[PDB]
Amino acid sequence: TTNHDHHIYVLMGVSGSGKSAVASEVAHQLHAAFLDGDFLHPRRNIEKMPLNDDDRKPWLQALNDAAFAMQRTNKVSLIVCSALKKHYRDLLREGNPNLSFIYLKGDFDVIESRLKARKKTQMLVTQFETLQEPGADETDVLVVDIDQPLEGVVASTIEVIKKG
Amino acid sequence: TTNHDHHIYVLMGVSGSGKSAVASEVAHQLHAAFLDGDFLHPRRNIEKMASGEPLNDDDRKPWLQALNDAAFAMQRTNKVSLIVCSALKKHYRDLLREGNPNLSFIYLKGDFDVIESRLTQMLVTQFETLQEPGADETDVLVVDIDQPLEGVVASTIEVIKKG
Numbered sequence: 123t124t125n126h127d128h129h130i131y132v133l134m135g136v137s138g139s140g141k142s143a144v145a146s147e148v149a150h151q152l153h154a155a156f157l158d159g160d161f162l163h164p165r166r167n168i169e170k171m172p173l174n175d176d177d178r179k180p181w182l183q184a185l186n187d188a189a190f191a192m193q194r195t196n197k198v199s200l201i202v203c204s205a206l207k208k209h210y211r212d213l214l215r216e217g218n219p220n221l222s223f224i225y226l227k228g229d230f231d232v233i234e235s236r237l238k239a240r241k242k243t244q245m246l247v248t249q250f251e252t253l254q255e256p257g258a259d260e261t262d263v264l265v266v267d268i269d270q271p272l273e274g275v276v277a278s279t280i281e282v283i284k285k286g
Numbered sequence: 287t288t289n290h291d292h293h294i295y296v297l298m299g300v301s302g303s304g305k306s307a308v309a310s311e312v313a314h315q316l317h318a319a320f321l322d323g324d325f326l327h328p329r330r331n332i333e334k335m336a337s338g339e340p341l342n343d344d345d346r347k348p349w350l351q352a353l354n355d356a357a358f359a360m361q362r363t364n365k366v367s368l369i370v371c372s373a374l375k376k377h378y379r380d381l382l383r384e385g386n387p388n389l390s391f392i393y394l395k396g397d398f399d400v401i402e403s404r405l406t407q408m409l410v411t412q413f414e415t416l417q418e419p420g421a422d423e424t425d426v427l428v429v430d431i432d433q434p435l436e437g438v439v440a441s442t443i444e445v446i447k448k449g
């Protein structure tokens with residue numbers, strides 16, 4: 123069964139919005155479970171690695187199943203998944219009423235500079251075109267401004283998680 | 287491709303050996319990737335634990351394949367990746383190793399006295415299922431869990447840095 127006393131937060135946003143870094147630190151501070159969704163891409167997906175809907179299908183099912191597994195024994199679970207399209211989000215939501223999204227939101231230049239700093243440019247543009255910012259119909263979406271130092275993003279994400 | 291410069295450590299051992307607590311802390315201190323493999327279990331597998339039934343080999347199969355896949359995904363962009371998996375049988379370990387030469391195991395080892403205190407019946411069954419890695423398993427590093435968490439964490443870090 124779904125445990126309503128427990129909750130899943132899917133950190134979403136385009137590649138470069140710092141999702142893993144944020145999730146890892148938040149998880150550590152809240153003693154929460156943490157899953158970087160990027161690790162569940164199918165064998166085949168890693169072999170290819172602008173992915174398509176059919177590409178993402180099995181991945182999103184895996185992430186839906188993982189969230190279900192995580193909420194059984196964890197009060198708080200964080201899953202990183204860009205979840206750019208509303209449909210991807212609805213897929214994560216299936217049978218998971220106790221799941222919400224924390225949208226790490228930033229402008230193109232902020233994300234572009236983080237990407238340029240890492241250890242692509244066109245994909246980022248493509249990232250933004252694909253992204254459908256959650257609208258008023260999605261009431262389980264909380265937004266955090268990533269145009270701030272890492273510790274601030276972390277603390278904004280924590281506030282968003284604790285406000286309820 | 288496999289990046290032999292990168293490494294995956296599967297923290298193994300029976301339930302109650304503190305696998306998750308150690309992995310979490312280690313990953314954070316090292317900035318390593320971390321996946322608790324329990325989260326990749328198929329619902330049916332979850333359910334057998336619901337009623338308190340000990341798991342089967344065919345049970346564990348897709349679970350292990352997905353852990354194998356996750357290890358391969360983790361090693362592409364992380365120099366150090368930690369996966370929690372009890373990996374009690376030698377065959378489970380072999381499944382995780384397939385295609386992953388850069389995967390080894392960190393065995394959180396303790397006997398029944400300790401794990402019972404650190405912790406009923408499943409524990410007894412865990413030990414029966416446990417096939418302690420022998421000499422034919424060279425990518426197994428052993429960590430004594432009969433010390434505080436801080437020490438376990440430190441011994442685990444040392445094991446990862448020795449190589």
Ligand SMILES: [Cl-]
Nearest residue numbers: 138139140141
């Ligand atoms: Cl990101």
Ligand SMILES: [Cl-]
Nearest residue numbers: 302303304305
């Ligand atoms: Cl454990």
